[PDB]
Homo-oligomer: A and B are copies of this chain.
């Protein structure tokens, strides 16, 4: 099952809130390298997480940016590896970091690389340009 479709499906699933598909497309024991911003006490910056850890982080993000969508811009494959560039678009519609909602939009780059075996993600690296998002939210005209 072609690895580029696995990754296109993954982001369609994240956008629609479709946990059943996400569990089909990601192995339970997949190694997920989230950036250091996603670290906590139990999981220091640079230590990997499993699928449910990743989905836990995603669930928490959906609470602050419920209209957020990741759109694949470029996609690149060689064998079981797939790399994507996405754009996350959304609004400041929920209060966060102590600032009440402004409605202001944001558009930030995500870069990802994933290893896909048997139609499922088994390793994944991702980083988002979080500082640019914050800059965009503090600058309308």
Contacts and interface: CB of A to CB of B under 8 A. Distances in A.
Number of copies: 2
Contacts of A128: 127
A85 B129 CA distance: 16
Interface string A79-121: 0011101000000000000000000000111011100000000
A81 B84 CA distance: 10
A111 B127 contact: yes
Contacts of A78: 75-78
Contact of A81 (B76, B108, B130, B131): B76
Contacts of A127: 109, 111, 127-129
A129 B76 contact: no
B135 A45 contact: yes
Contact of A130 (B36, B76, B111, B136): B36
B35 A135 contact: no
A20 to B, nearest CB: 29
A33 interface: yes
A109 B33 contact: yes
Given A81-B74, A112-B111, A135 B44 contact: yes
